[PDB]
Design a protein around this motif. Sequence first.
Motif, PDB file in Angstrom:
ATOM      1  N   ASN A 190      29.783  53.262  36.903  1.00 17.47           N
ATOM      2  CA  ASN A 190      30.442  53.409  38.195  1.00 17.47           C
ATOM      3  C   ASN A 190      30.223  52.173  39.059  1.00 17.47           C
ATOM      4  O   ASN A 190      31.152  51.688  39.713  1.00 17.47           O
ATOM      5  N   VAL A 191      29.010  51.624  39.065  1.00 13.19           N
ATOM      6  CA  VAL A 191      28.753  50.567  40.033  1.00 13.19           C
ATOM      7  C   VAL A 191      29.101  49.187  39.483  1.00 13.19           C
ATOM      8  O   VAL A 191      29.247  48.235  40.278  1.00 13.19           O
ATOM      9  N   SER A 192      29.332  49.069  38.162  1.00  9.63           N
ATOM     10  CA  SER A 192      29.324  47.756  37.509  1.00  9.63           C
ATOM     11  C   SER A 192      30.360  46.803  38.103  1.00  9.63           C
ATOM     12  O   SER A 192      30.086  45.608  38.282  1.00  9.63           O
ATOM     13  N   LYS A 193      31.559  47.297  38.399  1.00 13.59           N
ATOM     14  CA  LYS A 193      32.612  46.396  38.853  1.00 13.59           C
ATOM     15  C   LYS A 193      32.354  45.835  40.249  1.00 13.59           C
ATOM     16  O   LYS A 193      33.014  44.873  40.650  1.00 13.59           O
ATOM     17  N   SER A 194      31.383  46.358  40.983  1.00 12.09           N
ATOM     18  CA  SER A 194      31.107  45.831  42.307  1.00 12.09           C
ATOM     19  C   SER A 194      29.870  44.947  42.343  1.00 12.09           C
ATOM     20  O   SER A 194      29.519  44.432  43.406  1.00 12.09           O
ATOM     21  N   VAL A 195      29.217  44.748  41.204  1.00 11.69           N
ATOM     22  CA  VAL A 195      27.994  43.955  41.092  1.00 11.69           C
ATOM     23  C   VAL A 195      28.399  42.567  40.603  1.00 11.69           C
ATOM     24  O   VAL A 195      29.258  42.448  39.711  1.00 11.69           O
ATOM     25  N   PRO A 196      27.832  41.496  41.154  1.00  7.22           N
ATOM     26  CA  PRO A 196      28.190  40.150  40.685  1.00  7.22           C
ATOM     27  C   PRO A 196      27.992  40.032  39.182  1.00  7.22           C
ATOM     28  O   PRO A 196      26.940  40.388  38.643  1.00  7.22           O
ATOM     29  N   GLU A 201      23.363  40.028  29.540  1.00  7.45           N
ATOM     30  CA  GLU A 201      23.642  41.457  29.721  1.00  7.45           C
ATOM     31  C   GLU A 201      22.445  42.189  30.318  1.00  7.45           C
ATOM     32  O   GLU A 201      22.609  43.018  31.216  1.00  7.45           O
ATOM     33  N   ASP A 202      21.226  41.868  29.869  1.00  8.49           N
ATOM     34  CA  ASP A 202      20.061  42.571  30.395  1.00  8.49           C
ATOM     35  C   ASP A 202      19.880  42.275  31.882  1.00  8.49           C
ATOM     36  O   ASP A 202      19.582  43.180  32.673  1.00  8.49           O
ATOM     37  N   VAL A 203      20.119  41.023  32.296  1.00  6.06           N
ATOM     38  CA  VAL A 203      20.088  40.699  33.720  1.00  6.06           C
ATOM     39  C   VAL A 203      21.162  41.478  34.467  1.00  6.06           C
ATOM     40  O   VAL A 203      20.893  42.052  35.530  1.00  6.06           O
ATOM     41  N   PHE A 204      22.385  41.534  33.921  1.00  6.84           N
ATOM     42  CA  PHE A 204      23.446  42.241  34.618  1.00  6.84           C
ATOM     43  C   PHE A 204      23.105  43.713  34.813  1.00  6.84           C
ATOM     44  O   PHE A 204      23.336  44.280  35.891  1.00  6.84           O
ATOM     45  N   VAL A 205      22.562  44.358  33.781  1.00  7.25           N
ATOM     46  CA  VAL A 205      22.165  45.750  33.946  1.00  7.25           C
ATOM     47  C   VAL A 205      21.075  45.855  35.007  1.00  7.25           C
ATOM     48  O   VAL A 205      21.084  46.778  35.825  1.00  7.25           O
ATOM     49  N   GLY A 206      20.118  44.913  35.015  1.00  6.18           N
ATOM     50  CA  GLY A 206      19.136  44.896  36.097  1.00  6.18           C
ATOM     51  C   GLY A 206      19.768  44.820  37.487  1.00  6.18           C
ATOM     52  O   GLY A 206      19.318  45.484  38.421  1.00  6.18           O
ATOM     53  N   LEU A 207      20.813  44.001  37.647  1.00  3.49           N
ATOM     54  CA  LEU A 207      21.519  43.945  38.936  1.00  3.49           C
ATOM     55  C   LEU A 207      22.130  45.301  39.289  1.00  3.49           C
ATOM     56  O   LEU A 207      22.098  45.731  40.457  1.00  3.49           O
ATOM     57  N   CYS A 208      22.716  45.979  38.292  1.00  2.00           N
ATOM     58  CA  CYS A 208      23.296  47.298  38.535  1.00  2.00           C
ATOM     59  C   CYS A 208      22.227  48.313  38.924  1.00  2.00           C
ATOM     60  O   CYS A 208      22.414  49.110  39.852  1.00  2.00           O
ATOM     61  N   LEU A 209      21.120  48.334  38.188  1.00  3.53           N
ATOM     62  CA  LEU A 209      20.032  49.257  38.501  1.00  3.53           C
ATOM     63  C   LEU A 209      19.501  49.008  39.905  1.00  3.53           C
ATOM     64  O   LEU A 209      19.223  49.955  40.652  1.00  3.53           O
TER      65      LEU A 209
END
Length: 267
Positions: A190-196, A201-209
Motif C-alpha cells: 500500500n505505501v510503496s508508491k509514495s516512498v522514494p 531492495e532491502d533499503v527500499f523496504v526499510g524506507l517503507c517500514l
Amino acid sequence: GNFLKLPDTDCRQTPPFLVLLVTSSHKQLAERMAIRQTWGKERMVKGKQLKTFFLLGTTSSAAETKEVDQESQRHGDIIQKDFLDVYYNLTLKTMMGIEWVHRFCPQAAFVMKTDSDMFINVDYLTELLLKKNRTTRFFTGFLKLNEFPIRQPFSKWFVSKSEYPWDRYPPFCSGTGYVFSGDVASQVYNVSKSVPYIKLEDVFVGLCLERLNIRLEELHSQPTFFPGGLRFSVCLFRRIVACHFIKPRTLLDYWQALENSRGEDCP
Ligand SMILES: CC(=O)N[C@H]1[C@H](O[C@H]2[C@@H](O)[C@@H](CO)O[C@H](O[C@@H]3[C@H](O)[C@@H](O)[C@H](O[C@H]4[C@H](O)[C@@H](O)[C@H](O)O[C@@H]4CO)O[C@@H]3CO)[C@@H]2O)O[C@H](CO)[C@H](O)[C@@H]1O[C@@H]1O[C@H](CO)[C@H](O)[C@H](O)[C@H]1O
Ligand SMILES: *[C@@H]1O[C@H](CO[C@@H]2O[C@@H](C)[C@@H](O)[C@@H](O)[C@@H]2O)[C@@H](O[C@@H]2O[C@H](CO)[C@@H](O)[C@H](O)[C@H]2NC(C)=O)[C@H](O)[C@H]1NC(C)=O
Ligand SMILES: *[C@@H]1O[C@H](CO)[C@@H](O[C@@H]2O[C@H](CO)[C@@H](O)[C@H](O)[C@H]2NC(C)=O)[C@H](O)[C@H]1NC(C)=O
Ligand SMILES: O=c1ccn([C@@H]2O[C@H](COP(=O)(O)OP(=O)(O)O)[C@@H](O)[C@H]2O)c(=O)[nH]1
Ligand SMILES: [Mn+2]
C-alpha cells in the motif's frame, strides 16, 4: 495484478505458516534446483505448512524465456511479472513478491524474502517464530541500523546523491534474507508508491517500514542471520536461521551433512 505466472496454490484453503520467496536470475536453474531439493522442499514443520516460490522477471533471451516457461510448467512454483530481470531491478522483484503475498496469500502467517546463495534452517526459524508470540507488524533479520550509502562509483551497491541524497539509510535488514508477518506485505505494498524509490531492495523496504512506523526487532537473543557467511559445522548450522555465501554444490553437501548427522546430540 499483471502477473505472467502464478503458483498453483490456494492460501485461502490451507493458510501456510511460512512462505519463502526466493530471488534468482533466469540462468540460475542450478540454484533453484538445489533449493527445491534442500531447504525449499515444501513440507510440514512441527505441523506448520512451508511453501516455497521463486521470483522471476523477464529476459530478452528467447532461450532463457523458453527454459523458464518449461520450468514453471514442470514445477508450478514461479511468480513472474514483465520486468527486465537485472540486478538493478531487484526492488521491482521484491515488490512483486510482496504484491503476490498481498493479492493471493494474505493468510500467510510469515514470509521470508531470501536470496539463492543461502542456507536457510526452516526448522529452527519456525521454532523461534512460534516462540516470538508476534503475529502482526513484525519484521526481523540481520539488522543494519546506521548504514551509510556507498559512494564509491564503481561499487556493486553504489548510489549517487541523486539516487539517494541523504547521509544515512533508514534502518533495514540485509536482503540476503529477512522475515515478516504476512500483514506487513499488504502495508508495504500500500505505501510503496509514495516512498522514494531506491534500486537497493532491502533499503527500499526499510524506507517503507519506516513510513509505516514498523520497528525492526531481533529474532532471538543470539544472532541467527549471517550475511557475512560462517565456518560450517553441523552443530552451528542447527542453531542458525540463514547463512550467506553458499553456492549450490555447497548447499547440497551441507544438507547431506545435516541428514547424515540427524539424531546425534550436539554440545
Ligand atoms: C552481500 C551484502 O550483504 N551486501 C549488502 C551491502 O553490505 C555491505 C554494507 O553493509 C557496507 C557498509 O559499510 O559494508 C559491507 O561491505 C563493505 C564495503 O562496503 C564493500 O564495498 C566491500 O565489498 C566488496 C569490495 O568493495 C570490493 O572491492 C571487492 O571487489 O568485493 C567486495 C565484496 O563484493 O566489503 C566491505 C566489507 O564486507 C557490507 O557487505 O550493503 C548494501 C547497501 O549499501 C546492500 O544491503 C547489500 O545487500 C544486497 O542488496 C541488494 C539490493 O538490491 C539485495 O537486497 C540483496 O539481496 C542484498 O544481499
Ligand atoms: C510467549 O508466550 C509463552 C507462553 O506464555 C503464555 O502466553 C504469553 C502470550 C504470555 O501472556 C504469558 O504470560 C503466558 O503464560 C512464553 O513461554 C512461557 O513461559 C513460561 C514461564 O516463563 C514457561 O513455563 C514456558 O516457557 C511458557 N509457558 C507457557 C504456559 O506456555 C514465552 O516466554 C513468550 N515469549 C515471548 C517472546 O514473550
Ligand atoms: C527494469 O525493468 C523495466 C521493465 O522491463 C525496464 O524498463 C524497460 O526497459 C526497456 C529497455 O531495457 C524499454 O524498452 C522499455 O520501454 C522499458 N519499460 C518500462 C515500463 O520502463 C528497465 O530498464 C529495467 N531497469 C534496468 C536498470 O534495467
Ligand atoms: O538479475 C539478477 C541478479 C541477481 N538476482 C538475485 O538477487 C540476489 C542478490 O544477488 P547477489 O548475491 O549477486 O548480490 P550480493 O549479495 O553479492 O549483493 C541473489 O539471490 C541473486 O540470485 C536476481 O534475481 N536477478
Ligand atoms: Mn548474495
